[PDB]
Ligand binder design. Structure first.
Ligand SMILES: COC(=O)N[C@H](C(=O)N[C@@H](Cc1ccccc1)[C@@H](O)CN(Cc1ccc(-c2ccccn2)cc1)NC(=O)[C@@H](NC(=O)OC)C(C)(C)C)C(C)(C)C
Lengths: 99, 99
């Protein structure tokens, strides 16, 4: 699909057996999801945005479906106001910026 | 052009007669530049990201050339690690996300 930027580029994702709304974010190195209790080992990490750093849990090799396109990679989980799909997954579905 | 996302989508912009590198950011509502002087009256504003809120200077109706494409719009200036081009200007240059 082609997604215009008149509104926030929110799409449906599937993860851990839940459907969620997430922002397709070319300004994000990493994928950061709202708090959820995924199974498996994780590692602590601190990630920084505009207002400073937050503590997140890093989970590896989590399958994520983005608009019916399959992806698998690292997901960070923590106190974010919005679910963010970053470049680590956007590359996997062949996402480009075009103008 | 078509820009892939295996690296950060940094492009050269021209603003106030100066050249700067900036991130094309579909997850940003607003355009936020590192601290710099711009001509004209500004008003204090607050904007929020991950890590919380920051105070910025809001400048209205600033021309910005993004990879040779002209935009004129609101530019915020404040403490950011990277220059961010957000949706307010991305829409002006006809930028879309495609996969
Ligand atoms: C209405 O809210 C917004 O649109 N808020 C904004 C914002 O922070 N956007 C976020 C996504 C977002 C939206 C709304 C609420 C919370 C978060 C991103 O589009 C841009 N942001 C802007 C940003 C980009 C880079 C950096 C940075 C950090 C360390 C070293 C180099 N750069 C910091 C902030 N990037 C990041 O925060 C990412 N950071 C990142 O990839 O760090 C490398 C995360 C996500 C992985 C944390 C702006 C201030 C830019 C307008």
């Amino acid at each position: 699909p082609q997604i215009t930027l008149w509104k926030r580029p929110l799409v449906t994702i599937r993860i851990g057996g839940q459907l969620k709304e997430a922002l397709l974010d070319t300004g994000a190195d990493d994928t950061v999801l709202e708090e959820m209790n995924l199974p498996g080992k994780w590692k602590p990490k601190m990630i920084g945005g505009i207002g400073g750093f937050i503590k997140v849990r890093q989970y590896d090799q989590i399958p994520v479906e983005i608009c019916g396109h399959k992806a698998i990679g690292t997901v960070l989980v923590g106190p974010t106001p919005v679910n963010i799909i970053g470049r680590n997954l956007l590359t996997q579905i062949g996402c480009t910026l075009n103008f």
